[PDB]
Symmetry: D2
Subunit: 474 residues, 4 copies
């Protein structure tokens, strides 16, 4: 099995202990990654803080040049990297390659967005006549060392989405990949090293949560934490951050509100595409349908017809539904299915589990006493909840602890806009599925879905602070 190494101060480093990584869909041993000690974490962080001065003092053009070179290498190696990513997290091969290509796009876009960093000149005389000769020159500065923690379900894309915005602004970065996804994260690191990223400007950390999990976050060297993952883990990291700024991209339970005047066929298409992409292992998937009763029977039938068309199988054959990330995930999903069956929900598609490969299950007549109406499955199960009023749909949508995105399906757009104002989410898509993209758009979520605003320019703003220099004109 290929033995991988961490990038530490421009060098590739093994550790005494290793973690072996297996393909979720087959059990194939893919390789090993280091299990770092706390002392090895200290060395990563010390090398990053030492590199920071010379990195922040480079020009924006020079930092952008490194990012563009790294993106070119990712494009060159997209097939090579995608093939391993596909195996590591049981993502379809074509989709895995697409994740790498999208990462290159985000890196390039972040390089050009960030190099155009501008500041403000504020007039004292806007506020007080006596200060009319006093002006404030307000420029952006890096926050320092950014700890970027990527998630299993986008181990390259949602590493680069943090790395490149941080780096263009003059931050230094330590990437902690998820254990399942650490190989792909280190493959991304290879591109940044080959691009010539200066030693210590970008580093990687891998290891066991029991050894370094709290340590990497509590370390005084870290100035900013940028995390994507589960809501419980995110909340715990937040407790360890202190007053240091943190960004959290946590779970979702995005509602799809279907009104009586909606094109139910088009609604079903978008709903099924969004709900079941990557087997539903996405924070921004459609995860519950809130439908007006008078159209529920036909919407349910429309959704069912497309679910039965979803291909089910292995990542290497580019199936729509692939095996889930591990056995705990498939067990949790089966447990939600069973709770819905026990409580009287109607299964419109047939449950089948071969290993951790769960066939897509569609439930109708889901009620608010069922766990599936509320809990995020991270699996290919979709509930339908019938409502009698738009007010009821809004109330149930907002009753969720999550608030990432929502979809509204209707032909009355002025009405949809007014509904969107009332929904406790970050983004509402009209007559389409929820989605993070395009990556220039803001991406954020309310309540337990996280904290901070991403999308490219927003992520750059988040990982900078302002420095105001004030002086008096004579």
């Amino acid at each position: 099995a290929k033995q991988y190494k961490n990038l530490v101060n421009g060098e590739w480093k093994l550790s005494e202990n290793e973690i072996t990584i297996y393909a979720p869909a087959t059990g194939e041993e893919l390789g090993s990654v280091p299990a770092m000690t706390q002392a090895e974490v200290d060395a990563v962080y010390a090398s990053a803080k030492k590199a920071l001065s010379d990195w922040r003092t480079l020009s924006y053009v020079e930092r952008a040049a490194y990012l563009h070179k790294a993106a070119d290498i990712l494009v060159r190696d997209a097939e090579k990297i995608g093939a391993i990513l596909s195996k590591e997290v049981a993502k379809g091969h074509k989709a895995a390659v697409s994740e790498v290509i999208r990462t290159a796009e985000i890196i390039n876009y972040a390089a050009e967005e960030g190099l155009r960093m501008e500041g403000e000149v504020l007039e004292g005389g806007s506020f007080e006549a006596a200060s009319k000769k006093k002006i404030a020159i307000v420029r952006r500065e890096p926050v320092g060392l950014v700890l970027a923690i990527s998630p299993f379900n986008y181990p390259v894309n949602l590493a680069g989405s943090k790395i490149a915005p941080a780096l263009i602004a003059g931050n230094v970065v330590a990437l902690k990949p998820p254990t399942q996804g650490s190989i792909s994260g280190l493959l991304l690191a290879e591109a940044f090293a080959e691009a010539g990223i200066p030693a210590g400007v970008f580093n990687t950390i891998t290891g066991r949560g029991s050894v370094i999990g709290d340590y990497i976050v509590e370390h005084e060297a870290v100035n900013f934490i940028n995390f994507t993952g589960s809501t419980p883990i995110g909340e715990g990291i937040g407790k360890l951050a202190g007053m240091r700024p943190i960004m959290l991209e946590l779970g979702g339970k995005d509602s799809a509100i279907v009104l009586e005047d909606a094109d139910l066929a088009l609604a079903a298409k978008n709903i099924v595409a969004g709900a079941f992409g990557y087997s539903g292992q996405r924070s921004t998937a459609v995860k519950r349908v809130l439908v007006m009763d008078k159209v529920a029977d036909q919407l349910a039938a429309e959704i069912k017809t497309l679910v039965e068309k979803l291909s089910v199988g292995m990542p290497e054959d580019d199936a729509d539904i692939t095996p889930l990330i591990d056995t705990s995930a498939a067990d949790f999903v089966e447990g939600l299915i069973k709770d819905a069956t026990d409580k009287g929900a109607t299964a419109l598609t047939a449950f089948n589990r071969e290993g951790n490969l769960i066939s897509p299950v569609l439930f109708d007549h889901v009620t608010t006493d069922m766990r599936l109406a509320w809990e995020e499955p991270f699996g290919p199960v979709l509930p339908i909840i019938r409502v009698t009023t738009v007010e009821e749909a809004i109330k149930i949508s907002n009753e969720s602890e999550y608030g990432l995105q929502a979809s509204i399906f209707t032909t009355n757009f002025p009405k949809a806009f007014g509904i969107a104002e009332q929904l406790e989410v970050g983004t509402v898509h009209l007559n389409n599925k929820t989605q993070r993209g395009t990556d220039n758009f803001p991406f954020l979520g309310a309540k337990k879905s996280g904290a901070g605003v991403q999308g490219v320019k927003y992520s750059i703003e988040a990982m900078t602070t302002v420095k105001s220099v004030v002086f008096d004109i004579q």
Copy 2:
């Protein structure tokens, strides 16, 4: 009838000759304004350039205070000013008082928009690594002396819309009102004088076109020309502007496109309100209905019923339809009406003329060989043009030499947005009449409808420039 004076360098001045102003609806003598000589114009401009140095170096908050005080006085005297405005341009009494109130709202909003405008700091290292220590401190500055030329149909509101944005940014201003509307303009000036506006910072010019018309525009002291009026006069001002920046607000022939799924009663209500407000003497009036044939009979009937309810009479009686601004105006409108009748259009409401009071004429089955399909009437006549496709409506709308605004009446908003993209206008209103407001929104016209972007913040941007101070950090 009173004898009015120009505001020149803090003093109120008569001239040797004057212009007596009469009420278009009744012939009543309203008062007189000075007929300035070219030498007296020179004195206005020389006073303004002398005042600019001390005005531009005041704080924003000091300039805003003058503007707020002037707006307060306008509100106090809204009846006094509006009553004369009403007679001067045969605008309904209520509408004229409302014009003055709106002017105060625009002046206040401009003061607060302008006083918090900002500069920017740009990085040499965004463009060139060798320049990474070079920064540009970019601050706003006035353009200098603004010549504001207001129109007869809004002699106060479209004076204030120029004066206040100019003044908050540190420009000095000369107002040339229309001769018909010059008393109202001088009454506006009295408010700024009572507010304490420093001598020369704001001045007025009145006189005969034959004596000073070209002279005021060609004068080298003027740094910026801001004009509202007819398209032919605006074309003349362009020929005189030389290299100086100009803004022009000229004529329109705004289309109201009514699709098959429109709320025809809502459409008819908006169309009649927009078309016949101030007897059609507005650049932003609905001036042609482009309706899909399958709803045309019903839309026509709904419009006809509303047009028949409009009152026709004198400004003091707040008639919907008041007498037009002069005899040439009414002659021109009568000719358009006669051309349509003679070429076979259906007169749904009947033509009558008493003096220059023309009753509101609604034509159906208008064809594009009729002058009324294209020429801006500035009178109370509206054509209905039947089309068979949306594409034909777009083509006919865009064939016009004008391009100010358009209205689209439909329940399919994504489609309306796609239509709006193809319409050669500044603003498209969905399920509403065309309108300049709200005054924070951009107001602009394409093609022969003008040049530059107004609405408050845009007008301020247009009458400011920048000064950049570049240095190297050491």
Copy 3:
């Protein structure tokens, strides 16, 4: 000696128990404020959440109108409120009236800033040709219920600095003043009630920290915490906020860096003004002089002469140096002074204490082993620390746990800009004392000085989120 009441859902409410407040400088009984119960806290928050829907659905201009009226009432009552603020926190009478006037200025400025926070329209075709018909409409929304916690040293100004920016954006607010400072905060509340602020939109909470201290912050009704106070208290509040956003304005130890080419008399003038204002009880306040050896003797003599001339006495006599807020504060300052003397620092002005009135102490030859080099005194003591190089000055400045502001005194502005880049602070003032103002400028601290960015526009941005509505054009 009045009995004050909390504003709760538009009504003035006593509590079963109350707390008597005495003037720190004289011991005069000023009045009592309610000792609220946890149930009374619940009722405040329930009132706020009930009022939120009708408040956020008002127009911006309507919310601004309430704020302008409250500011007008504060100007009207500035002498009346300032007279009591002066006694309550032992601030000079004239300085206390000035605080009230400044609060009115900040409230008016926030109203006008917040009503023109515009939104963004983002193009999908900026990122992906396939998404060129997809656009994102991004508008700001309130976060909900803001808990505002004001400090004793600006109990009106740094209450209004939170209330007004919160309210204009459509948030509802509960103000918790410090107990010493609660009368002044309730007097501010009176202005908002007289202005007609709708019931429950703005409320106050008073009581003993033992009973309600943690309770007010941990309550799930609170969506946002905005705190000014000591670093230890703010740190503890940060832990109780969980994942909810929080702004912290904490302590400082602002350095004044004085180079060999500085105007020493000018530096001394500004240093003394900034260090000893309100007896040093300010977070933004020159609290250590880092001076190059060769001009240290000269600077110290200039500073000494000014310190000797500061007036020491009672608030009602507008003394420069007034009594500290309580006995614990003066004991703490005395302990720092005694430590510096014991370790060999030169007391250039003499220590004297009567009650809690400490005379201003200037120390020279302070070293980094002395507590006074690092700990924030919140009293009238100022250390001079001699350094041999600019590099050492930067190192010592940045070694502080605090990072609020710094001053640089030098005639080499390009060099000062480069030094400013290296200082771990929010704002650097060149050739002037550190200060929060003008209030349109950003105000922020690094490290233990807090979190979040204030100044008016920044505070409004902080207490809003964005809502993105995405749709596809046809």
Copy 4:
């Protein structure tokens, strides 16, 4: 080695019945010919642009940007080839000519990326009146239409690209009129855009005689925007013909270098000489008059003199600092300014010599305001030193110019320098540096007779865009 060049018109390369032969100003070498278009051929150019506009403005920003990046890559590839001809055509040093092409590619790339992330905005009716609180305005950017871009002889490629790429990224279509002297370089630039695949009619070129098409190209109703760099008299003419169409003008300058008593004289002299004599002073942004306080004037004049004497005087191919001026009229005009200064008593610190149109660099001291050289823009290698008594006098004399492009201030007192800058009637003030257009992201603008509009990259894009507002009521 002279080639017959053609205009790019609607995706095709077109000769005209008449042509204009172009000669190298430093040597007389025949370089080639460019077409002498008729008005009817201009009509065909504009008709093809307007027809191409509909499909071009509806492309995504990404798609438009890719064309620009490819064109820039091609210019970098051919920089040596293009620069070699540019050097001869406008008698610019060969190395400096190659650098101009490289800078052109940098501006094109930067404009593509600046323009593609431009945004619209949404405004609230409730900001202005309560009754309209549910009304919002969705405001998006749109091109203005057909941009006429007119480049200058002194930067025939760089200040063609500075107009073309900002215009194109925003969805405008473009017609480039190069100066006759420079038209070969302009058509060489066009070849790169053609090779990059720019759609037929989206970018086109026009060449011809002023007497035939000069006014015609500007007055034509197809043109929606005129973007011009050139002399002040020509720009005045364009303003007379623009009508109500938006214009941008980059005209002449007489930039002052204000040298205070506390100035770094060594750095001041270095920057003054580099800025004043770059490309023989044929730059709108050259240092063109030194306003120096009496106390330091003798020392500054001595050091400037020493550096002027170090400048090489010679041929473009030899990379001389001072090359021959663009034509005989230019040299005659410069000689006349020199004679007026001499006859009125100015001190010639360096010697005037003229060989053909190659004028040696002339430094004058004790220049007074009765002398033409105090005011008139030479566009040649002559620099006056004007001794002033105060900064107030330097401001007064600086602002008395009809020009108002840039200024330099040399002083160690930066807060004072900012207050001086506030009083100077110029677009940009450079502290302790020569005046200059760059960096190209910075604003570039001139007041008074120096022009109209603001360039630098993002500013030029803003100027050649308008907005479209769509207003609706939320329910």
